[PDB]
Design a protein around this ligand. Structure first.
Ligand SMILES: N#C[C@H](O)c1ccccc1
Ligand SMILES: N#C[C@H](O)c1ccccc1
Ligand SMILES: N#C[C@H](O)c1ccccc1
Ligand SMILES: N#C[C@H](O)c1ccccc1
Ligand SMILES: N#C[C@H](O)c1ccccc1
Ligand SMILES: N#C[C@H](O)c1ccccc1
Ligand SMILES: N#C[C@H](O)c1ccccc1
Ligand SMILES: N#C[C@H](O)c1ccccc1
Lengths: 162, 164, 162, 163
């Protein structure tokens, strides 16, 4: 199983992602997205390109990425700070079930997995996440994939932010 | 024209949904320099949130301030700084969400008779006439002289419309 | 004619300002000092630095700055709420004439005028005020200088305050 | 027993005596409004037809203003510049511009109880007259509300008399 051979389910409508807000990454690859909250934003009223934006929030820090649909069930991300581009795919999505939402996404380095993000708002109770993670772990560099929520800063009265 | 911060208008908090449909907004006028060059995103409570508090995100480049909020009496929103634990009682001077010309509002929090903070948000490049008259009224209360235009000389973007 | 090259008359003795109290600004640059009454205050008895204070009063709002002499006939202001400093000069003073008092003061942003206050207590009848305003308007940013006393709030029995 | 209508009514000193005292702070007041407050007196405007002086009551960034003219029985009649509301005030005592500075205590009455009380000084409350005046006014009806007005005041930013 090489990264480029992973499932690429269709991107849900943006409204499905927004109804899921907010989410937390239960499993990631690199340490960048440990202890992170995901929020999805519609495009600004006056945005000429009408791109949506993904917010990755870690305490007082935030990574932002505009995204648009691309070929082969892909999302193409534009890093708003650096202009860096990346092609992402969904291994699966399971948004807005009666037990909440989960998904797992990935970007590839040819055959290696460059980054992995599994999000949920049900504390990892979705059976699809278990299965997806085990499958992702056996991809080249999938050894790095880890539970992302172990040693996270203490909160000060907010549920989803610190 | 109301004289002190305690006497400003307090319109009903619109349903969260009206705010979320306005996402994202920018702050055209603020009181302290904390909220210059800032984009606001409203977020619904997490599914498993015990208190069902919504969250206001104040995003300035690569930095974020977060505040959970819930309804309070007299059309108040009570905020909880997610990083500090610090509480603040806010009100809306006016809201004008989701018009054919977009959304604007102005919100504030008082230190008694003075204004401690002020946030005028819009997604229509400051063209709502309500916003202009709101800013003029707020400036006249104690400490209101610090309220200023918040979007001069902000950093350059890298491909994104609403973030940098 | 740029702001850094405007006239800089000697700051009169404090007593001359206090004998003028209260004044109103006839012409100002920003909107801040519209519909505003100026009162000058002597240092407190126990003040170590013996700085005098300028009070800018607009309804129930007050802006306060201690000030002291600086070089080149400057007044250095200390905003009492922030500790921010600003360097002011007098374009002219004409205090305590038989037709009352007037002056025009200004603070620069290099070659631009950042703020302008022309005060009087004679309903703007000092011919010096008209010439001074005409000169300052020609300076960069000075196109914003405007008459400050149109459509001010109505009073409830007091002459100088509302 | 001492009631408000029966307190001392010393003559109002000339305005210049108050202006020479500027600025003052209130060490004792009745209502909450006049805590952490600086008092500044202003002469009438040149063009003011009635020539009423003005008292300024400044608390941080907020100012209350009252024109005043002398009335009967050593009274000052105050005109709130924002409401147009009138109040008759008196001085329990004045001690302006001694070699130890200035102090006074003034009051206004709701019949036999005291509606407001303002004890000003520019000497950190060291005038012996001031202690005595306060003890007396506290025993008047409602005078139990009179308190020290300078306990937990906001921190300053380089000015001495304003914050
Ligand atoms: N999670 C995650 C990815 O970075 C992602 C994928 C699609 C759209 C936005 C963001
Ligand atoms: N899992 C789960 C919660 O609903 C949750 C917790 C933190 C951030 C987003 C969502
Ligand atoms: N802080 C701030 C915002 O403008 C705000 C956020 C939620 C409710 C009221 C006001
Ligand atoms: N005004 C306005 C725009 O719609 C706007 C611009 C930047 C960020 C949010 C919103
Ligand atoms: N008018 C005016 C200025 O703010 C100013 C100038 C000199 C001294 C005090 C205040
Ligand atoms: N000009 C003039 C008057 O004397 C005046 C009017 C209002 C405030 C200060 C002074
Ligand atoms: N202190 C005090 C009162 O407010 C007052 C009394 C007489 C004159 C001016 C002001
Ligand atoms: N008493 C005393 C102080 O020195 C003081 C402080 C502020 C204003 C006037 C006077």
């Amino acid at each position: 199983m090489t990264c480029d051979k992973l499932p690429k389910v269709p991107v849900p409508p943006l409204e499905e992602f927004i109804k899921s807000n907010p989410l937390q990454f239960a499993y990631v690859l690199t340490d960048t997205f440990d202890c992170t909250t995901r929020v999805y934003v519609q495009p600004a009223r006056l945005s000429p390109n009408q791109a949506a934006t993904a917010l990755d929030i870690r305490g007082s820090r935030i990574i932002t990425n505009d995204f648009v649909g691309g070929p082969n069930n892909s999302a193409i991300l534009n890093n708003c700070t650096t202009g860096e581009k990346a092609t992402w795919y969904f291994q699966y999505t399971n948004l807005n079930t009666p037990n909440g939402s989960s998904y797992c996404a990935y970007t590839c380095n040819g055959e290696e997995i460059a980054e992995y993000k599994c999000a949920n708002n049900n504390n990892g109770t979705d059976p699809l996440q278990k299965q997806a993670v085990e499958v992702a772990k056996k991809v080249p560099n999938g050894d790095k994939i880890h539970y992302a929520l172990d040693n996270c800063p203490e909160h000060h009265g907010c549920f989803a932010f610190y």
